[PDB]
Amino acid sequence: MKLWIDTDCGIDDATAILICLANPSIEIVGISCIGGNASLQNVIRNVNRTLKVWGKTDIPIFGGCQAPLVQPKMEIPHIHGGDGLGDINDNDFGTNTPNKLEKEHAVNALIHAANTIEDLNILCLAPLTNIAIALSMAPEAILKIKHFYIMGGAENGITPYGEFNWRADPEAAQIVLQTYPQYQTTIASWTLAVFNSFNANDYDFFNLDGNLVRRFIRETWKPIIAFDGGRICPADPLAAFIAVYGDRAIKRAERLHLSMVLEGEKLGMSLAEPDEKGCLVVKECDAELFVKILRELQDHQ
Amino acid sequence: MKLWIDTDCGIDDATAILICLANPSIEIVGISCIGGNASLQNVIRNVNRTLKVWGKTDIPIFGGCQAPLVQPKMEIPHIHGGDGLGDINDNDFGTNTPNKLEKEHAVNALIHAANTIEDLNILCLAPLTNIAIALSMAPEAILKIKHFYIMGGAENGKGNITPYGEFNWRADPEAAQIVLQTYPQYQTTIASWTLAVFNSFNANDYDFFNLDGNLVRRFIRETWKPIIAFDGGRICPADPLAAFIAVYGDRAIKRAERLHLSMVLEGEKLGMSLAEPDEKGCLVVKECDAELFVKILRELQDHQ
Amino acid sequence: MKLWIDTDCGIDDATAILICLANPSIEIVGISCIGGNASLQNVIRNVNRTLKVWGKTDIPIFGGCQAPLVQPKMEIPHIHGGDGLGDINDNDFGTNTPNKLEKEHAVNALIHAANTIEDLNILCLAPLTNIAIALSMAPEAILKIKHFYIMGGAENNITPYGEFNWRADPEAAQIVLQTYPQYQTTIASWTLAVFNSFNANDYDFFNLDGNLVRRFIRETWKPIIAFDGGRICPADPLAAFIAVYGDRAIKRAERLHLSMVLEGEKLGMSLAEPDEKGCLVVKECDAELFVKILRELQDH
Amino acid sequence: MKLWIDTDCGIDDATAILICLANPSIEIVGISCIGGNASLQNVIRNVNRTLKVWGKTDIPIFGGCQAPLVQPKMEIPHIHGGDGLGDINDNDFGTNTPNKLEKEHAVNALIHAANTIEDLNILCLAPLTNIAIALSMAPEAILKIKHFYIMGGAENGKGNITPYGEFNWRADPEAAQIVLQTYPQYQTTIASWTLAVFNSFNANDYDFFNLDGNLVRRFIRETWKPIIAFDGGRICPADPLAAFIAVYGDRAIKRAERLHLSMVLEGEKLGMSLAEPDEKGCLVVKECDAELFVKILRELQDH
Ligand SMILES: O=c1[nH]cnc2c([C@@H]3N[C@H](CO)[C@@H](O)[C@H]3O)c[nH]c12
Ligand SMILES: O=c1[nH]cnc2c([C@@H]3N[C@H](CO)[C@@H](O)[C@H]3O)c[nH]c12
Ligand SMILES: [Ca+2]
Ligand SMILES: [Ca+2]
Ligand SMILES: [Ca+2]
Ligand SMILES: [Ca+2]
């Protein structure tokens, strides 16, 4: 499976990228970077940290846009750390090295990849700002992409509070949801993250040592575990888990047509509607396989 | 003055491009196209028709985006004609020739120009689509642009396409909001629909859009004919007034205000430009030198 | 208890102010305003909004300085919406009315109050600028104040990032900490708030309706809950909770001497050192009494 | 010219204040006091002496802040004497009389003067604590001030109290940085410590600081006697040069470089003025008309 990754690489993005790196069936052809919550300069550095912590370093990193399309970024008190990646120490990992960054804008490089790579998939882990612009510049190119895997949205389960990716750039989410075919789109929603939430203190796979990747997992997740009683709502790792393992990862899903509310009190929320040609919105995951996948990426290779 | 022009080349767009074509102190470095008055393909041919009629086809034309940012499209063939240029006949002008269209997308073309052309200015005569996309991709690039001259909005709150919204900013309000909160409004000069109505002309007391004797006079007469009838004999030279201000600078303005502009992005007033006084906002032209304006429109039509 | 409140009234300021209005043992004798979460002008409006929704507008409101002492802007400008109070609609709350401002500067007013009010306590929910200036012009007046309750600093294992008040003006914080007696100071730290936070998907006390105050709390906190994964980090409300309810609110604290790092890579941080003549740094709170106090002020 | 003076009146302040008093086109509308060369309490006493010696005590005097904003009062090897004015005897000058001191704090009186007096200029001869605090409280008010004249700093990197940094800006660096980054540096002239050592006379080649015949010459002679003895008999008239520029305009200035100044509020070298070229920065006087300087220094001592 060929896969492009779009990320605002915070803590859970890095574990999601690591899930893809840990499966030999996955060839990551490029990683695009978008700002917003975490600054774009910080995202590019954190993608570099993740790839350097892993073995393979032959993946081009592209910087995209610096802000949502139109909505304000809404300043963020990053309690987990200012660098957007748990405030880890580069000297503890051997990643105090120059960051790699391609010259091409992420929008154009994504378009070229879409034009020149057959059976290209994309895993989107961030606000869809980069994707919406590429669909605007060249809808013919992005429509060649085989399938879309997106972390975003909150459908009715009650609809939990706190969905981030689409609320951060609702116009971009609408551009994606109105242009790329929803039938070819698979959603790992914030409702799914909240539904498969667990306490990391009941496990040990976020608190291991013995290799660099294990230390990375433990140190990046450390502040999230501390400040929230151990509770974890896995969003991006679940989206990578679904993109990488397919129906093996899915227990139940619902076909739903999705739209963004761009006006009024419900601005930035989503409308969902049963529709066999709509998004595949995953409802239940193989959680036993998910935590097994989380441990395996930290095994000695 | 090096100038970039972004147009949905309708009838008044083309007359604005002739104003810039007619002044030798103006260098048009490239023309970006966007849907609006008509569809993007019609705009591209309309610009080609305009350049061919004038006779200086050495200006690159770039195809922009195919739709607004988020809004559905808003073609008005009952105003600018089915082809966006008054449904003229190409045999009346000798423009039955292939159209020039460069390979590079207008957004990437404009970003490049802002990066390699010094003291670049832009004249924006159409919905804020190509420009907003380019400010999102490369703000550091587009902020290199010396000044922004934009036809759009209405500080009165009196629109055309809606009671509250001017067409270009109502056709893509998010794009209009993107420009107004990203490019420095202090380096931005606005020729609104307010200005277009205030400095409007009665086409049966003024005949400068009704001459023959040369190709330019025929082009201007035939293109403006359907829109003059649609307006009731009235001419609201919105785009030509914006080019007038960009080309002729201070001596084109009679009264202007410094106003911070912001878009109404929802509700029945979608597309409305709110205005409030601010010495760091946009120079919103209130009165143009109508006398010098008609003068330069006649001079580009003279046989000499 | 007579209480002065120094605030940059963002969203959690307004709820902290409501905790003081809801307790009959508390007499708010004056509210000073400083920039921070919002501009000084926006802070004055938001205090006016909070007092009007409650209904006890008989409180003087003074405007302070317009910037931190030495630092340039704010490390986190425009944090609680464009208006500083979650961009609420005045027409929904009936607060589109003339706002009250007093005309003496907030510094001179705090100096006057500390010189004329016996047993005056002060609650500081914002960057230490108004206080540092008044301490620099009349320390004789400010030291008469009975006790200081300050939201700020992050002490500690693990230290949560993002502390605003002392990072926004580290000189003002150091002025206060080395001039007003720390033994008469009680701290609700950013560490305490982070470790005493709630998620809207587990607790509903900021998602109620049925009267004006419940609507004010829900709408103000709404964009915080929406853009922070549901996380409610109630820093200023915890400070007010400690100031108003005292020993009932505190489960554990430590006597620590606090100073500011004013140079180097660690600019804006807080050095803590065990010291029985230092500030009372609250470490644990009665979370159950706190959630009930939040709900109590929202009763019909 | 309407002029407000902020002083830590040591010896060279008093001569500078006398420079302003001597010119009839200058209107001193108020003198604010701050700790520096000596205690605030001595500064208030030392301005009173200076006005009594001249003979015009109709100028209001305001006590300012008791300490720097952030820094400690720090070691003052009392070079201006124990009392701050060369340890002179009031019985020798007829100044054994009550002092005058206004009720208002200097910060509030400065704010009020800025809001109610047209075309007010300020002359700063001391650590800038009062001005920064008034800038903190009312930028609206202090920006109505036409021009700032400030003795302080050293754009050459050669201070006095520290090898880097001049006394007035080393004594309160945060306040000096507040003034620079809030009051427009283009409306600011600087008599630097570069300037005080540059235009520095040896006292044994002039007699303008060793005269009698009237009370003003005795005051000047007795107050400068200690400061002259410290140096190699040299005269680095820091304060008086600043007053000379503020009063006598362009003819006071010979060569002047527009430079943007900023403060090092950190590190082993603490309290120095970072100098860089800036057309919109301070007007740092580099050379003063020394001949005209000595003549007005003599004339103020006339009968
Ligand atoms: O009556 C009109 N209604 C809508 N659009 C236009 C235009 C076009 N829209 C813009 C004016 O709003 C201008 O660029 C012009 O090309 C002219 N007249 C009208
Ligand atoms: O040797 C000195 N060391 C420290 N301060 C001064 C001063 C005082 N400090 C300022 C010059 O540094 C000036 O205003 C003056 O009043 C003169 N000479 C010295
Ligand atoms: Ca993410
Ligand atoms: Ca047009
Ligand atoms: Ca606050
Ligand atoms: Ca002095």
A 10 A CB-CB count for A230 gives 15
Element (H, E) at A6: strand A2-7
DSSP H or E segment with residue A231 = strand A231-232
- Kind and range of the H or E run holding D229: helix D215-230
Give every CB contact of residue D207 below 8 A, 6+ residues apart in sequence.
none
Alpha-carbon span B57 to B40, nearest angstrom: 19
Distance (Å, whole) CA B161 – CA C126: 48
Which parts of A228-286 fold into alpha helices (H)?
236-245
Question: How many Cα neighbours within 13 Å face the side chain of A296?
Answer: 13
Query: Could you tell me which of D183, D177, D104, D175 has the C-alpha nearest to residue D140?
Result: D183
Distances (CA, A) of A248 to A101, A242, A253, A290, A293: 34, 8, 12, 10, 12
Cα of D230 vs its chain's centroid, Å: 20
b (16+ CB within 10 A) / e for B218-237: bbbbbbbbbbbebeeeebbb
| Of D259, D146, D266, D128, the residue nearest D195 (C-alpha) | D259
Chain A closest-CA separation from residue C56 CA (Å) = 29
* Cβ neighbour number for residue D140 with a 10 Å cutoff: 11
* Residue whose C-alpha is closest to residue C108's, from C129, C137, C128, C132: C137
- Measured from the Cα of D227, ligand 2's closest atom is 18
Question: Residue with structure tokens 């600011």?
Answer: D188
Task: Quickly count: other Cβ atoms within 10 Å of residue B301's Cβ.
Answer: 22
- Cα-based distances in Å from C129 to C126, C151, C172, C186, C190: 8, 13, 5, 18, 18
In short, whether B160's Cβ falls inside 6 Å of ligand 1 is yes
Q: What are phi and psi of A116, to 5 degrees?
A: -125, 0
Say how far apart CA D110 and CA D34 lie, in whole Å.
13
Identify the burial level of B38 via C-beta atoms within 10 angstroms of its C-beta, where 0-12 means exposed, 13-18 middle and 19 or more buried. Answer: buried
Q: Are B278 and B259 in contact (CB under 8 A)?
A: yes
B294 burial (CB, 10 Å; 0-12 / 13-18 / 19+) is: middle
* D132 vs C216: CA distance, rounded Å: 39
The rounded distance, in Å, linking the Cα atoms of B243 and B59 is 17
Bridge partners, B32 (sequence order) = B6, B62
Backbone φ and ψ for D79, nearest 5 degrees, come out as -80, -25
CA distance A222 to chain C (A): 9
Q: Which of A64, A69, A267 shows the shortest C-beta gap to B69?
A: A69
Q: Which domain holds residue D181?
A: 1-303
Assess contact for B81 and B226: CB atoms under 8 A.
Answer: yes
Strands (E), chain C: 2-7, 27-33, 61-63, 120-124, 147-151, 185-188, 198-199, 231-232, 250-260, 270-274, 279-285
* Residue in B108, B137, B177 closest to A70 by CB: B177
Report which of C267, C235, C250, C113 is spatially closest to residue C186, judged by C-alpha positions. Answer: C250
Site of tokens 């362009």 = D250
Cβ partners under 8 Å of residue D1, min gap 6: D25, D26, D27, D119, D121, D247
Distance from CA of D174 to the nearest CA of C (A): 7
| Residue from A125, A80, A123 nearest A232 by CA | A80
Q: What is the DSSP letter of C110?
A: H
φ/ψ region of B244 (left if φ > 0, alpha if ψ in -120 to 50, else beta) reads alpha
Closest-CA distance, B198 to chain A, in angstroms, reads 32
Tokens linked to B248: 């002729």
Which residues lie closer than 8 Å to C153 by C-beta, 6 or more apart? C163, C165, C166, C173, C187, C189, C190, C191, C258, C270, C281
- Distance (Å, rounded) from C-alpha D31 to C-alpha D63? 9
Q: Among C282, C269, C287, which residue's Cα sits nearest to residue C232?
A: C287
Residues within 5 Å of ion ligand 5, judged at the Cβ atom: C 8, 13, 125-126, 236
For the purposes of burial, counting CB atoms within 10 Å of the CB of B53, is it exposed (0-12), middle (13-18) or buried (19 or more)? buried
Say how far apart CA D291 and CA D248 lie, in whole Å.
13
Residues pairing with D277 in the sheet: D259
D5's tokens:
């003076």
Using DSSP, state whether D234 is helix, strand or coil.
strand
The answer to whether the CB of B90 falls within 8 A of the CB of B45 is no
Q: Phi and psi dihedrals of C46, rounded to 5?
A: -70, -35
Residue C4 near residue C121, CB atoms below 8 Å: yes
DSSP letters of chain B?
Answer: -EEEEEE---HHHHHHHHHHHH-TT-EEEEEEE--SSS-HHHHHHHHHHHHHHHT---S-EEE--SS-SSSPP---HHHH-TTSSTT--GGGTT--SPPP--SS-HHHHHHHHHHHSTT-EEEEES-SSHHHHHHHH-HHHHTT-SEEEEE---TTS--SSSSS--HHHHHSHHHHHHHHHHS-GGGEEEE-HHHHHHT-EETTT--TTS--SSHHHHHHHHHHHHHHHHTTSEE--HHHHHHHHHHHGGGGEEEEEEEEEEE--SSTTTT-EEEEE-TTSEEEEEEE-HHHHHHHHHHTT---
- Among C237, C143, C227, smallest CA distance to C181 is for C143
- CA proximity to D199, closest of D172, D173, D235: D235
d(CA C49, CA C10): 11
* Ligand with the closest atom to the CA of C17: 5
Which backbone phi and psi does D285 adopt, to 5 degrees?
-70, 130
Question: What kind and span of H or E run contains D202?
Answer: strand D201-202
H or E stretch covering A42: helix A40-53
Distance (Å, whole) CA D198 – CA B265: 64
Give first-to-last CA distance, chain C, whole Å.
Answer: 25
| Catalytic residue selected from A6, A8, A83, A286 | A8
Question: What is residue C99's DSSP assignment?
Answer: P
**Chain centre to alpha carbon of residue A258:** 19
d(CA B37, CA B82): 10
The answer to whether the beta carbons of residues C126 and C8 sit under 8 Å apart is yes
Q: How many CA atoms lie within 13 A of D19 on its CB side?
A: 29
Closest CA to C191 of C152, C225, C217: C152
In single-letter form, the type of residue at position B98 comes to: P
Does C195 sit within 8 Å of A227, measured CB to CB?
yes
Considering only the beta carbons, identify the residue of D65, D177, D265 that sits closest to C137: D65
Closest alpha carbon to A271 in A170, A183, A201, A188: A170
Angle at C22 between CA C281 and CA C97, to 5 degrees: 115
C-beta separation of A42 from A84 below 8 A: yes
With CA atoms as reference, report the closest residue to A196 among A285, A301, A271, A293: A285
What are the structure tokens assigned to B227, written together?
Answer: 């829109």
**Strand, coil or helix: what is A23?**
coil
Work out the number of other CB atoms within 10 angstroms of the CB of residue A83: 20
Token pair listed for A121: 């998939």
Ligand 5 center to C294 CA (angstroms): 17
Contact residues on chain B for A70, CB-CB shorter than 8 A: 69, 174, 177-178, 265
Question: Quick one: DSSP state of residue C184?
Answer: G
Which one-letter DSSP state was computed for residue A100? P
User: A149 has which bridge partners?
Assistant: A123, A186
DSSP SS3 for D38: coil
Burial of B275: CB neighbours in 10 Å, binned 0-12, 13-18, 19+: buried
Q: Whose structure tokens read 């990754």? A: A5
Residue type, D42: N
Alpha-carbon span C177 to A171, nearest angstrom? 47
Tokens of A95: 């990643």
Strand D201-202, strand B188-191: pairing: unpaired
Rounded to whole angstroms, how far apart are CA atoms C210 and A280? 38
- Shortest CA distance to C125 belongs to which of C240, C249, C276, C291? C240
Number of domains in chain C: 1
Task: Look up residue A117 and give its two tokens.
Answer: 């790579």
Which one-letter amino acid corresponds to residue C156? Answer: N
Q: H or E stretch including C293?
A: helix C287-296
Encoding tokens for residue A148?
A: 């879309």
User: D35 is written with which tokens?
Assistant: 């700790």
Q: Which residues pair with B31 in a beta bridge?
A: B5, B61
Contacts of C70 in chain D (CB under 8 A): 174, 177-178, 181, 265
Of C188, C199, C185, C195, which is closest to residue C157 (Cα–Cα)? C195
- Count the alpha carbons within 13 Å of B129 in the hemisphere toward its beta carbon: 33
Single-letter amino acid code for the residue at C284: E
Question: How far apart (Å, rounded) are the C-alpha atoms in residues C162 and C174?
Answer: 18
Binding-site residues on chain A for chain C (CB distance < 8 A): 72, 74-82, 87, 160-164, 167-168, 194, 222-223, 226-228, 233, 268
Breaks following residues of chain C (C-to-N distance > 2.5 Å): 156
C103/C44 Cα distance (integer angstroms): 12
Q: Is A74 left (phi over 0), alpha (psi -120 to 50) or beta?
A: left
B20-36: b (≥16 Cβ within 10 Å) or e: bbbbeebebbbbbbbbb
Size of interface A-C (CB pairs under 8 A): 68
Q: Which residues contact C120 (CB under 8 A, 6 or more apart)?
A: C2, C3, C4, C29, C113, C114, C144, C145, C146
The candidate with the shortest Cα–Cα distance to C51, out of C107, C24, C13, is C13
User: Is the CB of D172 inside a 6 Å radius of any atom of ligand 2?
Assistant: no
Q: Please choose from B33, B79, B164 the residue to mutate so as to test ligand 1's pocket, defined by most ligand atoms within 8 A of CB.
A: B79
Do the Cβ atoms of A296 and A269 come closer than 8 Å? no
Angle between helix B173-182 and helix B130-137 axes, rounded to 10 deg: 50
Residue A54: name the closest of A32, A34, A84, A31 by CA: A31
Residue with tokens 């919550």: A37
The packing angle between helices C130-137 and D129-137, to 10°, is: 140
Token duo for residue B230: 């649609």
* A178/D294 Cα distance (integer angstroms): 83
User: Which phi and psi angles does D261 have, rounded to 5°?
Assistant: -105, 150
CA D276 to ligand 2 centroid distance, Å: 24
Q: What one-character DSSP code corresponds to residue A184?
A: G
Q: Which residues pair with A285 in a beta bridge?
A: A250
Of the candidates B264, A78, D247, the one whose C-alpha atom is nearest the C-alpha of residue C162 is A78
Instruction: Name the maximum alpha-carbon separation found in chain B.
Output: 52
Ramachandran category for residue A2: left, alpha or beta (phi over 0 → left; psi -120 to 50 → alpha):
beta
Q: Within 10 A of A275 (CB to CB), how many other CB atoms are there? A: 14
Quickly list DSSP for B51-109.
HHHHT---S-EEE--SS-SSSPP---HHHH-TTSSTT--GGGTT--SPPP--SS-HHHH
Distance (angstroms) between ligand 3 centre and the Cα of A149 equals 13
Q: What CA–CA distance (Å, rounded) separates A36 from A172?
A: 13
Q: Which chain residues have CB less than 5 Å from ligand 4, an ion? A: B 8, 13, 125-126, 239
When scoring A137, A171, A262 by the number of chain B Cβ atoms within 10 A, the one with the most, hence best to mutate, is A137
The number of beta carbons lying within 10 Å of the beta carbon of residue B187 is: 15
Q: Which residues of C204-239 are buried (b: 16+ CB within 10 A; e: fewer)?
A: ebbeeeeebbbbbbbbbbbbbbbbbbbbbbbbbbbb
Show me where chain B is broken: residue before each gap, C-N > 2.5 A: none
Residue with tokens 């708010």: C28
Q: Which atom of ligand 1 is nearest to the CA of B125?
A: 14
Compute the CA torsion angle B32, B36, B42, B43 (nearest 10 deg).
Answer: -20
